[PDB]
């Protein structure tokens, strides 16, 4: 059985219990913490690409009001985010299972941009998601996994100083 697990969930849960925020810039900002995934149960000899996208967790705009995050009243449909290909893709099952798959080079932006960067809506809440795509073989297959622990609101600057402090303490 293909098992997908979150590396350093202890640290993510510190961020989650304060409401995590991720900076987005015109040029794109790398994530901290970085999404690292533990993968077992692949065919060491089969070929796979690892894909990362961000699901809008709800249809609302959020705002930091009197030291607390609160959803707007006026939901709108949120089109799904573009997908980021892990730069080691495509690769053998063995490659992916020998160490945590680290999405350290993904950059989050608020502007439609050349390429690489993933555009998110500022003040929307996001749930990171990966797709493991078996490629090259005859039988294409996809396995998807969500990481609730890694939820965040996309912000152009930190609102909760407790988050600012955690980001620095653990970088």
Ligand X SMILES: CC(C)N1CCN(C(=O)c2cccs2)CC1
Which residue of this chain has its Cβ atom nearest to ligand X in the complex? 49
How big, in percent rounded to 5, are the helix, strand and coil portions of the chain?
15, 40, 45
Answer for which of 34, 46, 57, 85 binds ligand X (CB under 6 A) is 85
Q: Whole-number minimum distance, CB 99 to ligand X, in Å?
A: 19
What are the DSSP calls for 64-123, one per residue? EETTEEEE-S-----PPPPPEE-TT-SEEHHHHHSS-EE-TT-EEESS--SSS-EE--TT
Q: Which of 9, 38, 89, 113 binds ligand X (CB under 6 A)?
A: 89
Return the SS3 of 9: helix
Contacts of 30 (CB under 8 A, 6+ apart): 104, 105, 106, 107, 108
Number of residues that bind ligand X (CB under 6 A): 6
Those residues with Cβ within 8 angstroms of residue 94's Cβ, 6 or more apart along the chain or in another chain: 42, 44, 45
Alpha carbon distance 77, 40 (integer Å): 35
Minimal distance, residue 90 CB to ligand X, in Å: 4
- Closer residue to ligand X, CB minimum distance, 14 or 107: 107
Of 126-165, which residues contact ligand X (CB under 6 A)?
133, 135
Between 142 and 168, name the residue whose CB sits nearer to ligand X: 142
Interacting stretch for ligand X, rule CB under 6 A, among 4-12, 85-93, 101-109, 151-159?
A: 85-93
Stretch that binds ligand X, among 4-12, 83-91, 93-101, 148-156 (CB under 6 A): 83-91
Q: Indicate which single residue of 43, 58, 90, 127 sits in contact with ligand X (rule: CB under 6 A).
A: 90
Please state the closest distance from residue 6 (CB atom) to ligand X, in A.
Answer: 22
Residues within the interface to ligand X (CB under 6 A): 49, 85, 89-90, 133, 135
């Amino acid at each position: 059985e293909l098992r997908v697990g979150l590396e350093e969930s202890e640290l993510w849960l510190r961020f989650k219990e304060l409401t995590n925020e991720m900076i987005v810039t015109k040029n794109g900002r790398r994530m901290f913490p970085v999404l690292k995934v533990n993968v077992s149960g692949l065919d060491p000899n089969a070929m796979y690409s690892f894909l990362l996208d961000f699901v809008a967790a709800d249809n609302h705009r959020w705002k930091y009001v009197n030291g607390e995050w609160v959803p707007g009243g006026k939901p709108e449909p949120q089109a799904p985010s573009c997908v980021y290909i892990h730069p080691d893709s495509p690769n053998f099952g063995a490659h992916w299972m020998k160490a945590p798959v680290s999405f350290s080079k993904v950059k989050l932006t608020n502007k439609l941009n050349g390429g690489g960067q993933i555009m998110l809506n500022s003040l929307h809440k996001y749930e990171p998601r990966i797709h493991i795509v078996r490629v090259g073989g005859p039988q294409r297959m996809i396995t998807s996994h969500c990481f609730p622990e890694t939820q965040f609101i996309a912000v152009t600057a930190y609102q909760n100083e407790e988050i600012t402090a955690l980001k620095i303490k653990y970088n």
